[PDB]
Amino acid sequence: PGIVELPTLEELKVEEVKVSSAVLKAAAHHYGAQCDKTNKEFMLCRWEEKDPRRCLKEGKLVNGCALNFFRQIKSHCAEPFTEYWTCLDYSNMQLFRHCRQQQAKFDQCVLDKL
Amino acid sequence: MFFINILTLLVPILIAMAFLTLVERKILGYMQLRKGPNIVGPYGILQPFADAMKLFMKEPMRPLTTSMSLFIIAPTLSLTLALSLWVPLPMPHPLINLNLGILFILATSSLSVYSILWSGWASNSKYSLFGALRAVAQTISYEVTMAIILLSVLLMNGSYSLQTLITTQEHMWLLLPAWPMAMMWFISTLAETNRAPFDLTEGESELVSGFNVEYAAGPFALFFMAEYTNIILMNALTTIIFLGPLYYINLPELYSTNFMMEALLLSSTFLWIRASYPRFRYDQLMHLLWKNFLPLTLALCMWHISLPIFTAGVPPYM
Amino acid sequence: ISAFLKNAWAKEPVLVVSFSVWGLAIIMPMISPYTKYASMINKATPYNYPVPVRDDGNMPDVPSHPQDPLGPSLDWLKNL
Amino acid sequence: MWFEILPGLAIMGVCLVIPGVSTAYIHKFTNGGKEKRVARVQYQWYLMERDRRISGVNRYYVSKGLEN
Amino acid sequence: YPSKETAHWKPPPWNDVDILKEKAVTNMTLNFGPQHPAAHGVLRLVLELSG
Amino acid sequence: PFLDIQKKLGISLDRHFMFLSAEQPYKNAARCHAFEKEWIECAHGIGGTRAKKECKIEFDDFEECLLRYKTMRRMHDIKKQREKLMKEGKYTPPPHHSGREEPRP
Amino acid sequence: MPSTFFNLTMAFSLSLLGTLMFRSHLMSTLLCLEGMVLSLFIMTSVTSLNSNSMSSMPIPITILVFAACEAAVGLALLVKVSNTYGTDYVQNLNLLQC
Amino acid sequence: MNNYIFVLSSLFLVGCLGLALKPSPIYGGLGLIVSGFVGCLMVLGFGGSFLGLMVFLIYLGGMLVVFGYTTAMATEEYPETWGSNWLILGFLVLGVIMEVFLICVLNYYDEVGVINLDGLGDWLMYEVDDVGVMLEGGIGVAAMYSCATWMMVVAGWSLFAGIFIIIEITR
Amino acid sequence: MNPITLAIIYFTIFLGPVITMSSTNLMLMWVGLEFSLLAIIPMLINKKNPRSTEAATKYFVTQATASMIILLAIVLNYKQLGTWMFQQQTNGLILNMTLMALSMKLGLAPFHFWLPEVTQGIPLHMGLILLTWQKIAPLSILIQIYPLLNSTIILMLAITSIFMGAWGGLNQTQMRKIMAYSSIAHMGWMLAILPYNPSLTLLNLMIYIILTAPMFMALMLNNSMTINSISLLWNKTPAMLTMISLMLLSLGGLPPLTGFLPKWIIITELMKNNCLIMATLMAMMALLNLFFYTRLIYSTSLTMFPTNNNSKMMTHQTKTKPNLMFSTLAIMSTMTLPLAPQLI
Amino acid sequence: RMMRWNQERRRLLIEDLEARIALMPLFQAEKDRRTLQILRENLEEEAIIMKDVPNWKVGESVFHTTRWVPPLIGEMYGLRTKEEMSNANFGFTWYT
Amino acid sequence: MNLYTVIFINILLSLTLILVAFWLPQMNLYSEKANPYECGFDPTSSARLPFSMKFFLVAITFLLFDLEIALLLPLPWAIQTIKTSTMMIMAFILVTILSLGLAYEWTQKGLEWTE
């Protein structure tokens, strides 16, 4: 009946993480702690509206928060984090149980420095 | 590259079977106080090769009364299925990682019996029919309890995936929690491979030869090749499920080698039994299973449903 | 029946074992402290997303941040 | 003597070690020096496909870290 | 109402039991020998087997 | 049901898995959950005879969601025209539809 | 989905047709029934998987269970008719014409 | 791959056609084994897994028992294959060609409808939960232990009563 | 049969229909159908005589085919509407196939050739179940979908079965086959009035059951199974003749007896709906039923047939077989018209 | 021992699932933008292809309701290449 | 695609071995060689005649028990439920009913082969 209303390619543009799944897993827990309000607002938007076209402005804030988080890590705890997610990437299913020592190093580095 | 991996998984397995034949003959000879094959090549190593060449150079019979289609299809199916079943086995990394690997194993094993059934019916010979309808009873015997035993053991694994058993047995063998089931599973493998004391589908003494009476040359050789590959396979499944090797993500070679050691041990035990025991009758086998293992097997399945609950030790999924 | 049970124990041990194990399978779950924890653990396992719920200003227990003290705590699972 | 049995058993042991070792080595070789990522759930499939698109070489094993 | 076909029809048996033409039981005839691993070489045991 | 034993006794032996919009394991809603819910809530109260005419819009949306006949028609027409134009020589597949794109995260 | 459902409906139709027209052996008729069972199970399975309706996947298994039970009853009846007449031919099942 | 599922369904149709033509029960069992395999593959390709494997297992068991029964009761001095009877052979070929022609006819009359050979393989899967975890058909089936216990009750009773019914039919 | 088999088998026969009529889901109604089908067969083949086995096989094949057709209907309705119940929007062919397959289960013409044979083969005490208790489930399945049925198909089947049952009744000498054909005719009436007002379909089902059960127990009394055999009741058991006559006449459907009420009320409804031609033809052809019941009445009650020497010992010996339910049902079936308003 | 080891595995599984839950919001937004981009590209191409067909409304929905209906893979990858379509259909089933 | 490739490779390997076995050996076909085998003497009768199965009852019972296996095989995923008590009760009832059916058949001599 009515013409659908897809957003334009221009407004579907945002700076994107471009970091691999292993990296995201390694950063997950602290990324779940910090960057909670932003993600939760976006998620409530998704569930309440049910329309993906109506939560884009909040999703882009999600992306910005993720970029800020990862920039901070890259600025301070970069090398321990690289070690940690290398060890994770090696694992077949990216299981945490295999890299606990490097996880401890990274966790201590972030806890003190940041 | 995947093809190179396929080659590395097939060729060694076939050679291992080829030499399982020689090992069987030599072990039986020594246990019986004789030396066995030791003149064809140094220490008899060349006996399997000589046998295979002779069998594939002998004339393949095509008896008049037979049904050519099935009489030709069955051996192909036997070898194809026996080889295929080696596909998903973790050692420690399966060539093909199947979520429901155990059900795939059960399906392939069950379809294995149709090789014997069709070959026996197609032979159109009385001894062939005897062998085929004995194999039917053999299946009716083992298949009822094999599935329950696998269910009960997997009730500590949480998923039908084989690879998950590697982690399950990270700190312990599953044998200890379920030694009662390990024994029933061992006898079930003995029956499924159609080997003594349960080699009633080809029992030379009663039927000149069973399903394979009219088969000759290469078509025959395929049956035995599949039989011995299946012996190795089933003992590998036992070694992976129970008797878990040592897995450390640092070295998969440790898992591979320890698995080899244990699988050879069990494969040798198969021949040990063959030389040690008489042969069941083909009604005594069914009576044995149905009236001894199944009553115990159902109770054990009940108990292993209860265990994860009243011990609060539910297996994880994923 | 001591006599019949004693005979069964020797002449048909398989059935004695089966019936005993079945009886235990029923009895033990009722008699065991840990049984309650199975359903709690399976409820603890978070397969789906925890959907945030809009704060109308009068929801006093559900937290605002995951690290806030309020909300279910898996200390019981941690030291089961 | 029973020692003369063991040549065939040694041939067997080698022939059954090759499958597992070869599989592990080849999986590691063809998956960027890391064991093959198993996809036992749509979540794992989605992660792998995201890596495939992110890497820019259409390869899931090629990992881009903080630098990207 | 008899018709062309129904002439050869007959009344049903009083009790439902019906007398049937005997089914001869034809046991299979196996040759357990001479050349059998258990025939000791020279016995043509003509077994008459059912099942 | 011919006799409403279940409604009489307050039990629900089989009334909870009648349609796609009922509770699913682990809260995985079936295809067309919203459409089916709309249709059924529209058709509650009013009888079946009246629903067959007063909830028709919802039913049409529901069948379209579930079977998707019109969607197949539309895609078929679009690709038919694409083929005709291509054979004529008046169209080219853009880079992103062809095979080389700038893959998004 | 559409082509698959068409072919599956045709398969069930052919198996029903085979059941309706006999051919001496009762065992073959039982097998045709069993084939219709297969087709119906496949229909239900594909429909459920297509709709992502995991609450209706308990039902194909019930189909299999009940079809297996009826097939067992059929086999027992075959055994009895064979004991009666020496074969499973359906021609012999003509006494009740009178 | 585009024609994967359609080919599998056509093979299922052919196996069912053979079964309908009804050769000797041995060939019927073989045909049904092939058909069960193909159906399991179709279910697997439609995202299923447990259901396909279960059908294959149960059908292998069923045809095993059926074959055992056929060798004993459903047997003939000269079992008839598909090719032995000229009428069966001719109607096998006729059915194959008839299905081919019927496919063409339906495609022509409805360019998009029951069959869309053009655009085939473009509608196999409709939707998937990309980031889900618990979406495996085994979960839905296991639901019989929680949300659909009535299904379990009726099926278990069916098997239980089957035991007694079978014993007393075979008495 | 041992007691435990009796308990389980009878309980399953009772369960099946109850599941069918108390299930909201089409698959569960199908489960009830299968329960009845599986459980009845051992009772049928209990005798283990050559005729019994063949009757059981005929029943099995026919009912299995019907169940599969119904299951196809259910599955296709699922494919269409994502549900397990028939809706107004459901495709017409699905409902046509359901009506056709439930017709085969019920025994209605032209799928009626199977019922006479099975009834002839099986013993009376199971013939009663077959011709009474096993119809409740399929007719319930139809009644639950009555607003969507096809008037043309239903009327065609109904009139076909009336004609076929009436014609078949004449030729038969066997009581078992006669009762099978009577079943066919009465089911024809039931389905004729189903699409218009199922309350009267249920009324006809009740009255037919309440009339058939007494007759079947009457036959059981002396194991009578032929016109000649039943002709000897004037000697073996004179008392029953009066009620047997009244009951046969009622089943035929004479006015003073109850049997009129079903036919009269159904004709009234059909006329209200303007179904004059079918109503007239059905009423006309329902008189062959009275003819082949009147022949029985002549043979048993109004004329005295030749007897045998050995019936004297049957006279000598005592009898304790007629139940209380016989008297209750017989009177309440053949003397209840004055309470008709309460029935409808 | 199995009880204790299984409990440990339960804790580890909860940890991993929590990691997934933490990361999901990012994936949901990325998927939202990606699917919308795919849809709009399809719309542009449709605009060009169906320029002159007599009666075509370019963005017409097949649904009366104005609610957002998730796009199914046929719509999403229809105009793309057979490789992408078959990937969408079989990537998970046909293993990794 | 990997599973298809490996299974087709297995099929091709087996079929190639068969073809080599049938086209390499030197052959001599004649009636006496080809005729069936029966311990050195000619067949008294063809092997297609009926062959009584003395375990028919147990064979059928296998069907129902295997369907019970099917009903039980979801348990590994079932245990991941929240209604653990309900799952336990249902599984216990199912297995106990299985056991009772087997016990009744045994006591009724179902498993004793028919002579």
The two tokens of residue I329 are 């049902």
Number of D/J CB contacts below 8 angstroms equals: 16
Q: How far is CA J70 from the centre of its chain?
A: 9
The two tokens of residue B5 are 């991996």
- Helix then strand then coil, in percent of chain H rounded to 5, is 70, 0, 30
Answer whether B308's CB lies under 8 Å from B155's CB. Answer: yes
Q: How far is B260 from chain H (nearest CA, A)?
A: 30
J95 touches chain K (CB under 8 A): yes
Find where tokens 């389980």 sit: I8
Q: How far is J54 from chain C (nearest CA, A)?
A: 47
Q: How far is C8 from chain A (nearest CA, A)?
A: 50
Whole-angstrom distance, CA of residue B133 vs CA of residue B139: 10
Is the domain spanning K2-115 CATH 1.20.58.1610? The answer is: yes
**E48 - beta bridge partners?**
E29
Answer whether I158's CB lies under 8 Å from I282's CB. Answer: yes
Q: Do K56 and H170 touch (CB under 8 A)?
A: yes
Q: How far is B23 from chain J (nearest CA, A)?
A: 37
Number of H/I CB contacts below 8 angstroms equals: 39
Helices F56-67 and F33-43: angle between axes, nearest 10 degrees: 160
Q: Which long-range contacts (CB under 8 A, 24 or more apart) does I277-283 make?
A: I278/I155, I278/I158, I278/I159, I278/I192, I281/I159, I281/I162, I282/I158, I282/I159, I282/I162, I282/I188, I282/I189, I282/I192
At residue B111's C-alpha, the angle toward residues B106 and B113, to 5°, is 110
D54 touches chain F (CB under 8 A): yes
The two tokens of residue B193 are 């491979």
Whole-angstrom distance, CA of residue B223 vs CA of residue G20: 41
Report H helices in E1-51.
none
Whole-angstrom distance, CA of residue I266 vs CA of residue I203: 10
By three-state DSSP, how is residue E16 classified? coil
How many C-beta atoms surround the C-beta of residue B268 within 10 A?
Answer: 18
Total domains in chain D come to 1
For this experimental structure, what is the resolution in angstroms? 3.9
Whole-angstrom distance, CA of residue I60 vs CA of residue G71: 10
The two tokens of residue B69 are 């289609």
Q: How far is E45 from chain G (nearest CA, A)?
A: 27
Whole-angstrom distance, CA of residue I168 vs CA of residue I184: 10
User: What is the residue-wise DSSP string for K53-105?
Assistant: -TTHHHHHHHHHHHHHHHHHTTHHHHTTSS-HHHHHHHHHHHHHHHHHHHHHH
Reduced 3-state DSSP string for chain G: CHHHHHHHHHHHHHHHHHHHCCCCEHHHHHHHHHHHHHHHHHHHHHHHHHHCCCCCCHHHHHHHHHHHHHHHHHHHHHHHHHHHHCCCECCCCCHHHC
Q: In sequence order, what are the residues at sequence separation of 6 or more whose Cβ sits closer than 8 angstroms to the Cβ of residue I84? A: F17, F18, F19, G56, I25, I26, I27, I74, I77, I78
Q: Do H119 and F17 touch (CB under 8 A)?
A: no
Whether G and E touch, i.e. at least 3 CB pairs below 8 A, reads as yes
The closest alpha carbon to D36, from D26, D50, D22, belongs to: D26
Q: How far is C73 from chain F (nearest CA, A)?
A: 21
CA distances for J33 relative to A14, A41, A55, B225, H131, angstroms: 9, 17, 10, 57, 15
Whole-angstrom distance, CA of residue I46 vs CA of residue E16: 12
Category of H130 on φ-ψ map: left (φ > 0), alpha (ψ -120 to 50) or beta? alpha
Whole-angstrom distance, CA of residue J28 vs CA of residue J40: 18
Omega before E34 within 30 of 0, i.e. cis: yes
F64 touches chain I (CB under 8 A): no
How many C-beta atoms surround the C-beta of residue B4 within 10 A?
Answer: 12
CA distances for B270 relative to B113, B142, B199, B212, B314, angstroms: 20, 17, 12, 22, 35
Q: How far is H131 from chain C (nearest CA, A)?
A: 10
Answer whether H56's CB lies under 8 Å from B105's CB. Answer: no
Total domains in chain G come to 1
F84 touches chain I (CB under 8 A): no
Q: Which member of K41, K51, K53 has the closest CB to residue E28?
A: K51
Read off φ and ψ for residue E31, nearest 5 degrees. Answer: -115, 85
Q: Do C42 and K80 touch (CB under 8 A)?
A: yes
Answer whether A44's CB lies under 8 Å from J33's CB. Answer: no
E22 touches chain I (CB under 8 A): no
Whole-angstrom distance, CA of residue B177 vs CA of residue B308: 12
The closest alpha carbon to I215, from I264, I188, I252, I162, belongs to: I252
Omega before J70 within 30 of 0, i.e. cis: no
D39 vs J contacts (CB less than 8 Å) = 92, 95-96
Q: Do A2 and J40 touch (CB under 8 A)?
A: no
DSSP character at residue E47: E
Instruction: For residue E28, give the H/E element and its range.
Output: strand E28-32
Q: How far is CA B40 from the centre of its chain?
A: 28
Report H helices in chain B.
2-31, 47-57, 68-85, 101-123, 126-154, 163-168, 179-192, 217-241, 252-276, 284-288, 294-310
For chain K, the domains span 2-115
Q: In sequence order, what are the residues at sequence separation of 6 or more whose Cβ sits closer than 8 angstroms to the Cβ of residue H32? A: G31, G34, G35, G38, H15, H19, H59, H63
Find where tokens 């597949």 sit: F93
Query: To the nearest 10°, the Cα dihedral for I102, I108, I111, I113?
Result: 130
The closest alpha carbon to I125, from I58, I59, I176, I173, belongs to: I176
J45 touches chain A (CB under 8 A): no
Separation of first and last alpha carbons in chain J: 34
Answer whether I106's CB lies under 8 Å from I139's CB. Answer: yes
Q: Which is it for the CA torsion B119, B122, B126, B129, positive or negative?
A: positive
Burial of H109 (0-12, 13-18, 19+ CB in 10 A): exposed
Answer whether B303's CB lies under 8 Å from B177's CB. Answer: no
Read off φ and ψ for residue B251, nearest 5 degrees. Answer: -130, 105
The closest alpha carbon to J38, from D58, D57, F103, belongs to: F103
Omega before I50 within 30 of 0, i.e. cis: no
CA distances for E15 relative to G80, I46, I50, angstroms: 20, 14, 12
Q: Which member of B97, B176, B316 has the closest CB to residue J9?
A: B316
Burial of I242 (0-12, 13-18, 19+ CB in 10 A): exposed
The closest alpha carbon to I31, from I144, I143, I141, I147, belongs to: I141
Closest residue, chain J, to D45 (C-alpha): J92
Category of G86 on φ-ψ map: left (φ > 0), alpha (ψ -120 to 50) or beta? left
Omega before H25 within 30 of 0, i.e. cis: no
Q: Do G34 and H32 touch (CB under 8 A)?
A: yes
Whole-angstrom distance, CA of residue H8 vs CA of residue G8: 10
Q: In sequence order, what are the residues at sequence separation of 6 or more whose Cβ sits closer than 8 angstroms to the Cβ of residue B179? A: none
The closest alpha carbon to D47, from A35, H130, J17, C47, belongs to: H130
Reduced 3-state DSSP string for I34-80: HHHHHHHHHHHCCCCCHHHHHHHHHHHHHHHHHHHHHHHHHHHHHHH
Answer whether I245's CB lies under 8 Å from I301's CB. Answer: yes
The closest alpha carbon to B213, from H66, K10, K47, belongs to: K47
Q: Which member of A7, A14, A31 has the closest CB to residue J22?
A: A31
Q: What CATH number is attached to the domain comprising G8?
A: 1.10.287.3510
Whole-angstrom distance, CA of residue I222 vs CA of residue G28: 42
How many C-beta atoms surround the C-beta of residue K41 within 10 A?
Answer: 13
Answer whether I33's CB lies under 8 Å from I136's CB. Answer: no
Whole-angstrom distance, CA of residue H23 vs CA of residue F45: 56
The two tokens of residue I93 are 């062919």
The two tokens of residue D17 are 């070690």
The closest alpha carbon to K22, from B214, B224, B57, belongs to: B57
Q: How far is CA B29 from the centre of its chain?
A: 23
For residue B234, what are the domain limits? 2-318
The closest alpha carbon to I50, from E13, G30, K56, belongs to: E13
Q: Do J41 and F57 touch (CB under 8 A)?
A: no
CA distances for H129 relative to C42, C45, H135, J70, J72, angstroms: 22, 19, 8, 11, 11
Whole-angstrom distance, CA of residue B7 vs CA of residue K59: 41
CA distances for I122 relative to F46, I43, I53, I228, angstroms: 49, 9, 9, 20
CA distances for H120 relative to C9, G48, H4, I239, angstroms: 67, 21, 10, 77
The two tokens of residue C41 are 């653990």
- Subunits touching K (CB < 8 Å, at least 3 pairs)? B, C, E, G, H, J
At residue B222's C-alpha, the angle toward residues B217 and B225, to 5°, is 120
The two tokens of residue F22 are 């009922």
E16 vs I contacts (CB less than 8 Å) = 47, 49, 51-52, 121, 123
Maximum distance among all alpha carbons in chain F?
71
The two tokens of residue B289 are 């299973």
Burial of B250 (0-12, 13-18, 19+ CB in 10 A): exposed
For residue G73, what are the domain limits? 2-98
Read off φ and ψ for residue A7, nearest 5 degrees. Answer: -70, 155
Amino acid letter at F47?
Answer: G
Q: How far is CA A91 from the centre of its chain?
A: 20
Q: Which is it for the CA torsion A18, A21, A22, A28, positive or negative?
A: positive
Q: What is the CA radius of gyration of chain B?
A: 20
Instruction: For residue J16, give the H/E element and its range.
Output: helix J2-49
The two tokens of residue B187 are 């006898």
The two tokens of residue B110 are 């069950």
Amino acid letter at I79?
Answer: K
Residue of H55, H141, H163, H171 best to disrupt the K interface, most CBs of K under 10 A? H163
D8 touches chain A (CB under 8 A): no
